């Protein structure tokens, strides 16, 4: 179908099928057991954020890798069930579409996770070259294969140079994995998200420390953002003013899977609507907080 | 009577292959992944099929995408599926299988839906005239004992050369199952059952349990890497050493492979001794491979 120019928010990242089983007690290797319940669930950061963008009322698209098969089929159908445009998927002739097994111990809350295989090629810079950008008002990139992703950002930068300011594509990036190669991604984007887990691995004990201690790594004029779960979230821009919003805890915490992606998507959304950074931190915290008290993404409205 | 019928479960196996089992609450990356049509009766058809024996599966499926996969795989193997007891109240079973590549160990997390078990009422609708052998995965006793009843009846009215051979698998240590022991010319009991029931070895289990079989029936007990044993009406104990591959990589469906190969052998007129041995040969060969393709 036809996508009006400059209307869509794109997220580039991982889609994965999570098979989530609820057990009484962790299984002894080599046993056989009945779970209490078992859910198949579309997962992955970029993928979760797409869902949140649609439910919020943004037109949005996912770009990641998949391979023909029954897993992709279920994933594509779950994407479409959430109104996500999947026409930018990078279909692959080699490799398994990512699938993960997660086992949630019902008598202690602990998650044991068999994570997907590494067989499937990441979206590459040459793949991104073939994409007509005029669709997108905002492009958000989940840091994975950094050396390639840098080329994509450089290509968006090149596109932008020629556009009137009112047709520039905003860019955001997320570094959520404590992996040296990713750290070069700070240098890109108007908005850079850093996870609590990355901050800590770099030795920072709080949002504020993380921001003050990493802002030097981001490009001129960029905003750097760090959610710290129940401690809410900070952002730091060019003006050096450390911004903050408290959390919005829900009556009781049901499900936190994807709360971080929900917050990313919500900030992006608010910013893309022309709200202030401070207004967007708040909204982010409000939406992610609400979601944490619901199963899945259903009632975040 | 050209075909073999198996009566049990078909289950979607979502398989992860890992090089060590994850410590509780840890997170490990798997070597690779695949989907497999599994379930006992389902695995046996795979095996009979591979061995060259026309066969048919009879179990409860629920229409959907899962079933479309299962059915397609069934057919890709040449398994007659026309006897499937379709439903509308429940999903088709599935499970996660973590397969330790270092010792082929397999760990199974089963999601059992509502999908009710095939019933005598479904079975009484079966043209027994196509079947040389009928094998029954022991599940709902009460309701299957009737299925057996039907077969015993049908046999009375037939030449001692046109009778239908019957095998029963008693997989679970459940008391309801203790009565299937019971019927059939060949009774398979697993190591787990035997153990979960007071016995320390195949030889013991066969002595312990023989008193419960139909006159002239063979009691069979596999015992993993120790091989397998059998006991007939003549009271001579039969053993077969295992055939371990040099590298065990995937034992998912070993037992079922053993059962199918014994059944195949017996249905070709081989002696019980030859059948025990062929059973271990194929099960062993399969434990050296991921999946089933390549046993023959
Ligand atoms: C800044 S927006 C945000 N709010 N909350 C939140 C606030 C109050 C009560 C409950 C949740 C979050 C929780 C997580 N994530 C988790 O808490 C996970 C729990 C398991 N360990 C990983 C973190 C991620 C983001 C948020
Ligand atoms: C009698 S035919 C047979 N051979 N093998 C075999 C022999 C040597 C190496 C590997 C396998 C089997 C293994 C199982 N079953 C298992 O190994 C199970 C694995 C999980 N723990 C329970 C036993 C069941 C039957 C057989």
UniProtKB/Swiss-Prot annotation, chain B:
InterPro entries: Ketohexokinase-related, KHK, PfkB_dom, Ribokinase-like. GO terms for cellular component: cytoplasm; cytosol; extracellular exosome. One of its GO terms (molecular function) is fructose binding. The keyword Acyltransferase does not apply. GO terms for biological process: fructose metabolic process; regulation of glycogen metabolic process; response to fructose; response to glucose; response to insulin; response to sucrose; response to zinc ion. It is linked to Fructosuria: Benign defect of intermediary metabolism. This is Ketohexokinase.
């Amino acid at each position: 179908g036809l996508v009006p120019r400059g209307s869509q928010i794109l997220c580039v990242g991982l889609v994965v099928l999570d098979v989530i089983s609820l057990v009484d007690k962790y299984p002894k290797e080599d046993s056989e057991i009945r779970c209490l319940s078992q859910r198949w669930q579309r997962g992955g950061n970029a993928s979760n954020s797409c869902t949140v963008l649609s439910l919020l009322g943004a037109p949005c698209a996912f770009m990641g890798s998949m391979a023909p098969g029954h897993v992709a089929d279920f994933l594509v159908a779950d994407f479409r069930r959430r109104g996500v445009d999947v026409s930018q998927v990078a279909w692959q002739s080699k490799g398994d579409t990512p699938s993960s097994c997660c086992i949630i111990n019902n008598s202690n809350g602990n998650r044991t996770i068999v994570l997907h295989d590494t067989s499937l090629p990441d979206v590459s810079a040459t793949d991104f070259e073939k994409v007509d950008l005029t669709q997108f008002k905002w492009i958000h990139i989940e840091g994975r294969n950094a050396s390639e992703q840098v080329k994509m950002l450089q290509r968006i930068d090149a596109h932008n140079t020629r556009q009137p300011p009112e047709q520039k594509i905003r860019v955001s990036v997320e570094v959520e994995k404590p992996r040296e190669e990713l750290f070069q991604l700070f240098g890109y984007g108007d908005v850079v998200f850093v996870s609590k887990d990355v901050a800590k691995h770099l030795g920072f004990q709080s949002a504020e420390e993380a921001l003050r201690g990493l802002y030097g790594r981001v490009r001129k004029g960029a905003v750097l953002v760090c959610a710290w779960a129940e401690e809410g979230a900070d952002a730091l821009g060019p003006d050096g003013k450390l911004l903050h919003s408290d959390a919005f805890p829900p009556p009781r915490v049901v499900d936190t899977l994807g709360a971080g992606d929900t917050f990313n998507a919500s900030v992006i959304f608010s910013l893309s609507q022309g709200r202030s950074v401070q207004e967007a931190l708040r909204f982010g915290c409000q939406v992610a907080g609400k979601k944490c008290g619901l199963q899945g993404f259903d009632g975040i409205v």
